[PDB]
Amino acid sequence: GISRDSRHKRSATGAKRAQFRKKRKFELGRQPANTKIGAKRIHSVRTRGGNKKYRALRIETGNFSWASEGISKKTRIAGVVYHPSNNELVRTNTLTKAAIVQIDATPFRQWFEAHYGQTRAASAKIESSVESQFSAGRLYACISSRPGQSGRCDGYILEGEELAFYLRRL
Amino acid sequence: MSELNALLKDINGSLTATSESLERLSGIYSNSPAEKVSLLSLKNGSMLGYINSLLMLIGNRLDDECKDPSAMDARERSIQHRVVLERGVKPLEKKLAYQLDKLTRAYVKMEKEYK
Amino acid sequence: QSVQRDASKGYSILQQTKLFDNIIDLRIKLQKAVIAANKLPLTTESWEEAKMDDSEETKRLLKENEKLFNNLFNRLINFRIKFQLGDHITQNEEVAKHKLSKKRSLKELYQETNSLDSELKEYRTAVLNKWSTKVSSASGNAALSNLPADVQVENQLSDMSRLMKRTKLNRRNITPLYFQKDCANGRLPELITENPYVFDDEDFYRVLLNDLIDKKISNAKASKGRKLNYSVQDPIANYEAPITSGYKWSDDQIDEFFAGLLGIQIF
Amino acid sequence: VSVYQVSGTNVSRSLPDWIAKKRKRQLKNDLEYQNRVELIQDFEFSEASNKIKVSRDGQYCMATGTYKPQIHVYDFANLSLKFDRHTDAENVDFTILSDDWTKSVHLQNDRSIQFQNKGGLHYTTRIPKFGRSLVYNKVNCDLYVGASGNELYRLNLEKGRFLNPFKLDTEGVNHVSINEVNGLLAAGTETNVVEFWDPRSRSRVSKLYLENNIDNRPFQVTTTSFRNDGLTFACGTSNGYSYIYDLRTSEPSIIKDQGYGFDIKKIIWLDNVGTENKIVTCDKRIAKIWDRLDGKAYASMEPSVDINDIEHVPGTGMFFTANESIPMHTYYIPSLGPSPRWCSFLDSITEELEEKPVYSNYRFITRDDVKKLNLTHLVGSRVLRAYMHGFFINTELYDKVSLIA
Amino acid sequence: VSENFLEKMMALYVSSHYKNSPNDLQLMSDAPAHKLFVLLPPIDPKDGGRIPDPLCVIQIALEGEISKESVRNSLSRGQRAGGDLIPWLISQQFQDEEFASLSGARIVRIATNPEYASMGYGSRAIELLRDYFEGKFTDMSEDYSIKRVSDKELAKTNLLKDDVKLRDAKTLPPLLLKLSEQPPHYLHYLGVSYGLTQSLHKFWKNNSFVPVYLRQTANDLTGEHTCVMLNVLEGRESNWLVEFAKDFRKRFLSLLSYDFHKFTAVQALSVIESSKKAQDLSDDEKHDNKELTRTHLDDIFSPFDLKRLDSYSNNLLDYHVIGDMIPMLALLYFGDKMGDSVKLSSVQSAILLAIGLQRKNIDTIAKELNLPSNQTIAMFAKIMRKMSQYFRQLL
């Protein structure tokens, strides 16, 4: 039923074009994948060609990357906090790309103690806000993957002016 | 720091707290023609006697000389007020509880309407 | 007028609860003092043995302890005198005002406690017998004619010895300072677990706290359709038909309930 | 009281269902597979269900799914899937206008309302702002749709036109419900208030401020329902507390705690079945049946997966619970009433049912709350009993302690 | 004013009754045992004392305190004295002398505004009325007799000059009295006499009354059976009610076949529950139901009968083969001899009661309960299976 054909729209002049032809299979769309936090739950989608797309209907874990330190760890996703496109995705805790989520900081905390031996010092120094978040127990991260296409919720921890701007918006 | 020093200090602060709360208690009473219920009033008058007996027992406990250490006089008075609350006043309140609650319920409703 | 009288009594009843609840708060604060008091040294020698540990510091605290206690036990008597006066418990207005005006020593204050107790003792006999009569007649016990409260109070009071032993019970297992030393030296004649010198009113204390806690609980732009368009829509026109019978309740009854929603001498 | 689960997932909570299908080909040999019994064939969405309701006839059951967003319409007479129709988005709510399955209204998650006849989608209309609930007043032929905005939008199917919206003091409408005998349209806003509206007139009959003495955390109403008698009323708070208000007086008759701190997703007034004084409260994890007058729990139905919505087949013991799992669970409480007509021989086979059996009785407290309440000293005492990451306590003791704090 | 109020009372009073007679007015006015109670809405202070319409009116008749010698002497003569209905009936049916000596008040009539029926006002009035006699409405603030015409005044008045006037208002007491002002009479029980209907029985069952008697002969005018229901106030002896409630329960179970076969299965069941609630009122364990003994079982049922029972549970028999045993099984279960081991749902209890005691055919139950015959038999077999298992356990 969903279609991407541009024939139905009005012409640039504003004329109402007539229905040229029936809907074709090569111009289809599929229903959105409202990823919500919960037990992992994905089903494959057989797309054009032999390719396959994974639909992340539900997901609770993701690989998140600390870019400044250039490390990546698998962490649980606590909950959505702020989403730029629409707010009501925040209310229902829906996951999509560019959504800001709160992730458990425990693996990063353990790794940091392992690598730096601190709860040498100048390198260990990190932004004040990130240390405050570590104290809190949850880290603000931005999802970089597209859960409705690849079935993953990979992303990275907010840092610097990213963190400043999003904290202001919060 | 001697064990007695800790006890004196613990008594010292506890007594000081007793002073502030009593001063607040006196002020609230002074703020409070509305007719005061006799039985419930006696309950308060009875209990203030009980607290008075407790303090005068403590005073005997504070006294270094300790002439009457078992503190029969303070202990007897504490019994006197205790029995009145437990055995005399308390059964009457339960038998009067329903009408007391109803009367109080009437006021809070009216005060809401005025507000 | 009658509603106003009921309201005023309802008002008056409340402060008695609030005033009582405050007195509970007074007892709660004093609970630490009573526990510390029972632990204190029991004899002059133990008190002397206690003082030597920190002579200067103990001397300072003992002086401070005397002052605040005397100021307190002064203050309680003043409030008690005022309370018994305002509630008409004491009828001699002039004497009460004189007592408030004059400062009192410890012995004089001890004397006043006896006078206040005696005034209360007479008041209890009148009030308890008064209310016992009211309740029994209300219950029909007068029509029936369970002992009167004033008589009940005396019977328990006559049984002082059992009340004597209940307090001596050391439920808390409090051990006074240098208690073992005084026992070894035969300085504690009464003893020569129930300890006469230790006072335990925790059972009464626990009942009061339970009563306080329970009372609290009982009291407790147009694009995308973002602008509304009221123009008729043919596909949904006449999608369904109304029921002519109407709501189950009559229109009158419905109106009355909505109005009330969420709130000769005849009388 | 005995509770029998007729249809549902039988695996443990930790082990997810899709593995069960993978194991199932390995478990074809086991006698349990041959002996396992399901009433309605294909009584399952691909990944999960959202909302399930039974038609007035009692002949048809309707549901909505996660992916692809589908609308199954089960026929009881044939114990089968009569038809499944796809949609363009997920469903937040729907109501079956006609007595049968024939005619229905769906509020999707894209601010759209869809009208579906037998053949298929009939017409689509889009309300000005996002919708959250839906109700139909049959007498006036008006469709009332809750909205994230202050306006409570009103749509008239008979005249086929939006009429003037009802303005509400606060912005947000989580649920709407209509008193059948009266017609009061109780709107449950995000703040602790329910705005009761006369439908015939356009007025605010009153507003009811909910109060929770135990907790100071602000809470949101999530569900409202009226009893068929017409005078009693219900509410569900975001803190997990359900209330029963008698409309004539503002004070709450009872404040029962489910205890898990999870919102109250639906409330069903079990008047018809028998022993009318029973009310069902549903949470994310547990649903409990308790008497409306005394507050004593009767029986509780705990599935091993989150409950999205529950519904009661009228005049029977069957309980349909829409879950977040592939099968849609069915519950039969024999004590309440007889089994439905279409499950004639369900009674005979009662023994082979699982007969699933503390947890519904007590309240659940997390570790953090224990520190907040300074109940740490009781850790390890008989007062507090453990299960997953929190301890259980008696509801009265919790209310005793929380007030103290 | 009193005339205006009197009419409003009679309007509410007469409205409930099908065909009232004028004589009851005299009974209300003259009879010393009768007192009138009125439930009034909240009075607005702004009304200036305007009489509010009565929402519920209760007429109670005080009864009891009969001398034991009078009870024994008149019972031997079989003569009923005028008044004191409930004491006389209960004494006759139970042959107990103690109850007649007890004091009670009978609720002769209760009426509520028909438009406001079912709104819960009826349950409020009884609740307040019950609390009144228990003694809860005690006065909180620290006479109503009228001076009678003296013989001297009567002697000094001449027939021609006699000035017949309404009594002066100052002498008269107030028309409506707060409950606190006038003390209640000491009472042991409150009683009701009414024709058995489902709406009424539910109303009284909710108000903590207990059934003690049911008249076998249906009333000719109404077709209903008169029932006597009693309640014991707090702080009074309760054993006698418990003994009556049990014994009446035993009468009902056997009597269901003779004349109460017309009663619906649900209605008959509810009466049992109300009586059983009386047992719950007795916290004492002195009077408790006895579990059936092994010897008692053998007397009732032979070994072949038990084997016949078990085979049906295994579905190796036809239903007709166990038709003979259903009534005895019904008596044992509803008598509570079987104990906590066997419990049944509301529907199953209704089914067993019908075949067992009503002696109704299986198809008749299917229609009354709106179930198919197949399910009714299937549910019944489950009841038997529970019963067979218990006998196995006891053996």
From Swiss-Prot, chain A:
Main location class: cytoplasm
CDD domains: Ribosomal_S8e_like
Transmembrane parts of this sequence: none
Region (Disordered): 1-30
Keywords assigned: Cytoplasm, Phosphoprotein, Ribonucleoprotein, Ribosomal protein
PROSITE patterns: RIBOSOMAL_S8E
Location of Phosphothreonine modifications: T61, T106
GO molecular function: structural constituent of ribosome
Listed Gene3D superfamilies: 3.10.290.70, Ribosomal protein S8e, subdomain
GO cellular component term, pick one: cytosol
Phosphoserine modified-residue sites: S65, S68, S72, S85, S128, S129, S132, S135
One GO term (biological process): translation
Cell location: Cytoplasm
Known role: Component of the ribosome, a large ribonucleoprotein complex responsible for the synthesis of proteins in the cell. The small ribosomal subunit (SSU) binds messenger RNAs (mRNAs) and translates the encoded message by selecting cognate aminoacyl-transfer RNA (tRNA) molecules. The large subunit (LSU) contains the ribosomal catalytic site termed the peptidyl transferase center (PTC), which catalyzes the formation of peptide bonds, thereby polymerizing the amino acids delivered by tRNAs into a polypeptide chain.
Subunit structure: Component of the small ribosomal subunit (SSU). Mature yeast ribosomes consist of a small (40S) and a large (60S) subunit. The 40S small subunit contains 1 molecule of ribosomal RNA (18S rRNA) and 33 different proteins (encoded by 57 genes). The large 60S subunit contains 3 rRNA molecules (25S, 5.8S and 5S rRNA) and 46 different proteins (encoded by 81 genes).
Family the entry assigns: Belongs to the eukaryotic ribosomal protein eS8 family.
The protein, known as: Small ribosomal subunit protein eS8A
Swiss-Prot record, chain B:
Name the record gives this protein: U3 small nucleolar ribonucleoprotein protein LCP5
Sequence positions bearing N-acetylserine: S2
Function: Component of the U3 small nucleolar ribonucleoprotein. Required for the early cleavages at sites A0, A1 and A2 of the pre-ribosomal RNA. Participates in ribosome biogenesis.
Something else known: Present with 1430 molecules/cell in log phase SD medium.
Localization per Swiss-Prot or TrEMBL: Nucleus, Nucleolus
Disulfide linkage: none
Swiss-Prot record, chain C:
Induction: Up-regulated during cold stress and following nutrient replenishment by dilution of cells fron exhausted to fresh minimal medium.
Gene Ontology CC terms, in alphabetical order: 90S preribosome; nucleolus; small-subunit processome
Entry keyword set: Coiled coil, ER-Golgi transport, Nucleus, Phosphoprotein, Protein transport, Transport
Signal peptide annotation: none
Subcellular localization(s) per the UniProt record: Nucleus, Nucleolus
Superkingdom, natural source: Eukaryota
A Gene Ontology BP annotation from the UniProt entry: protein transport
General function of this protein: Involved in endoplasmic reticulum to Golgi transport. Involved in a protein-transport step blocked by brefeldin A, which disrupts the Golgi apparatus and its incoming protein flux. May also be involved for mass growth or cell proliferation.
Family: Belongs to the AATF family.
Remaining remarks: Present with 15400 molecules/cell in log phase SD medium.
Identification of the protein by name: Protein BFR2
Complete-protein stretch covered: 167 to 533 of 534
Curated annotation (Swiss-Prot), chain E:
Protein name, per record: RNA cytidine acetyltransferase
Domain N-acetyltransferase: 38-173
Gene null: resulting phenotype: Leads to a strong inhibition of 18S rRNA synthesis. Deletion results in an altered alkali-soluble beta-glucan phenotype. Heterozygous mutants show haploinsufficiency in K1 killer toxin resistance.
Described purpose of this protein according to its UniProt entry: RNA cytidine acetyltransferase with specificity toward both 18S rRNA and tRNAs. Catalyzes the formation of N(4)-acetylcytidine (ac4C) at positions 1280 and 1773 in 18S rRNA. Required for early nucleolar cleavages of precursor rRNA at sites A0, A1 and A2 during 18S rRNA synthesis. Catalyzes the formation of ac4C at position 12 in serine and leucine tRNAs. Requires the tRNA-binding adapter protein TAN1 for full tRNA acetyltransferase activity but not for 18S rRNA acetylation.
Family in the record: Belongs to the RNA cytidine acetyltransferase family. NAT10 subfamily.
Compartments in which it is found: Nucleus, Nucleolus
Binding residues annotated for acetyl-CoA, in chain numbering: I110, A111, T112, A117, S118, M119, G120, Y121, G122, S123, N206
Subunit-level organization: Interacts with TAN1. Associates with 90S pre-ribosomal particles.
